[PDB]
Design a protein around this nucleic acid. Structure first.
Lengths: 141, 176, 131, 38
RNA sequence: AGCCAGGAUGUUGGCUUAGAAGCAGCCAUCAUUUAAAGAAAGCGUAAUAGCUCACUGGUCGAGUCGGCCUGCGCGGAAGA
């Protein structure tokens, strides 16, 4: 790819078709037609699952064409649906929101192993635990 | 001190002569003369120029470092020459060169004609830009300041005479 | 980096890699970013993981102070940023020609991959390695 | 500029200089930190 | 101290979902990729973006940095 020209990382949940109210002007910073985006993104949405918090980088090129490479959903929200605690952090030091098994979080990170920039998966999975400490959890096994 | 002990590499063919307290050098560009402070004992005596804090005077080391940078920049002038790129930001601001006088229409009710001191050949490659060359770092810096003294860059749209690499911190209108 | 042993903790890590060393090369990092950081460190992760030496402390009185141990042919490596690469498993492994593939892959200024030892000469890219 | 009798570095880019006897705190970023005296 | 480099991965984190993405503020104040980079010091953004510093490569080349106790001084310091 190229250097910083006109792209940033945004776009929340993929289930939200045409997120003009939330994102808004960020799409308008460039000449990005949102329906042109929905034409391509929703063409990629119907591949695995619908209604998941997804992150994508809207990389715009000079010839008016734009490409996008998606990524795995946030470990923070993966922490909310896998365990069933939809609140999030809230109060990490006052109320421990939830807890999950090591075996579970390891294989969840193993799939993300091909999506992460790490070398040791054991070290990579405890990084998710570091996020779990940020969300207010207890690593139980 | 750290700059006072640094020898100055004077280029080949460049004439330098130390007449006691006064110094006169000359390269391809021009003749720059300067009188040093008595607290510094300077000696050519070589292929380079060494500086020494003469005895008696207490602040000798401070004065020595000063004198070094002067002659260092003096040999850069007589051999290369200095350039000051000025940019005139703003609609209606045109520059002109007439012999040795710069004509500037800086939005006033009258054109301002600045007189160039000596050896300063100003040139405007563009009507909104002035590439000004010279032979001495001191006076080239001063005349660049004077043209900027006619119109300092206002912090709202950056209108006015500025430098090439000058960054202007623009303020914003209160509400709208 | 606090005291003398702080320098020595790096040198013991240094000589440990030299005590079982093999083919090696060098690439500078004055034009590289964090993007190419994970291109050769993942290459290290392609071998096994982290222990692939890429420690950058090659001062003429630091890493050269650690060269008299072994690999004496590395005396005048001195300046021009040096980043090493070890091959503990696999005598004459792929790590040498990895920079040939890398120089054409987002690395532009790579100090001309001058290399260090084993051809018992100066830099020359060997492609006829025992696979 | 603030003609405060007591001056000190308000930020990171502030720096004390002693021009012509009086102590001045010039600032490289914001003009509001520029002060003179003390 | 300067001159050239990097200054990163999850990470749009959660809370009033109108937004607080190191940068209003509330919690943890992580672990990794590792020569190294605080989930953060300042500037700046509706929010991002963008620019620096922390730390770390090389170059360079000598001592130097932050405070304490004291002598003598400067500012603070304008009236008929």
């Amino acid at each position: 790819a190229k250097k910083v020209q006109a792209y940033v990382k945004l776009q929340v949940a993929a289930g939200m078709a045409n997120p003009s109210p939330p994102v808004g002007p960020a799409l308008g910073q460039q000449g990005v037609n949102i329906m042109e985006f929905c034409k391509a993104f929703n063409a990629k949405t119907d591949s695995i699952e619908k209604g998941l918090p997804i992150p994508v980088v809207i990389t715009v090129y000079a010839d008016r064409s734009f490409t996008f490479v998606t990524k795995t959903p946030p470990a923070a929200v993966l922490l909310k649906k896998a365990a069933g605690i939809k609140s999030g952090s809230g109060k990490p030091n006052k109320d421990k929101v939830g807890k999950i098994s090591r075996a579970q979080l390891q294989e969840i990170a193993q799939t993300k192993a091909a999506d992460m920039t790490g070398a040791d998966i054991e070290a990579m999975t405890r990084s998710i635990e570091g996020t779990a400490r940020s969300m207010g959890l207890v690593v139980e096994d | 001190s750290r700059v006072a002990k640094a020898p100055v590499v004077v280029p080949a063919g460049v004439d330098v002569k130390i007449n006691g307290q006064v110094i006169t050098i000359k390269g391809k560009n021009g003749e720059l003369t300067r009188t040093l402070n008595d607290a510094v004992e300077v000696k050519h005596a070589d292929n380079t120029l060494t500086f020494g804090p003469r005895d008696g005077y207490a602040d000798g080391w401070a004065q020595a470092g000063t004198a070094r940078a002067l002659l260092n920049s003096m040999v850069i002038g007589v051999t290369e020459g200095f350039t000051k790129k000025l940019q005139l930001v703003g609609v209606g601001y045109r520059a002109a060169v007439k012999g040795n006088v710069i004509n500037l229409s800086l939005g006033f009710s009258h054109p301002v004609d600045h007189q160039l001191p000596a050896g300063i050949t100003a040139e405007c490659p563009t009507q909104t830009e002035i590439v000004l060359k010279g032979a001495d770092k001191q006076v080239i810096g001063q005349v660049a300041a004077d043209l900027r003294a006619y119109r300092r860059p206002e912090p709202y749209k950056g209108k006015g005479v500025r430098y090439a690499d000058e960054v202007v911190r623009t303020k914003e209108a209160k509400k709208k | 980096m606090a005291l003398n042993l702080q320098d020595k903790q790096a040198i013991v890590a240094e000589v440990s890699e030299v005590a079982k060393g093999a083919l090696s090369a060098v690439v500078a990092d004055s034009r590289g970013v964090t993007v190419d950081k994970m291109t050769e460190l993942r290459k290290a992760g392609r071998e096994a993981g982290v222990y692939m030496r890429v420690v950058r402390n090659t001062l003429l009185r630091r890493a050269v102070e650690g060269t008299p141990f072994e690999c004496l042919k590395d005396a005048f490596v001195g300046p021009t940023l040096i980043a090493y690469s070890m091959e503990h498993p696999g005598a004459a492994a792929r790590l040498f020609k990895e920079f040939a593939k890398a120089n054409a892959k987002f690395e532009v200024k790579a100090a001309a991959f001058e290399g260090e030892l084993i051809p018992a000469s100066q830099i020359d890219r060997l492609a006829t390695l025992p696979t | 500029m603030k003609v405060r009798a007591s001056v000190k570095k308000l930020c990171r880019n502030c720096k004390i200089v002693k021009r012509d006897g009086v102590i001045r705190v010039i600032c490289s970023a914001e003009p509001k930190h520029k002060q003179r005296q003390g």
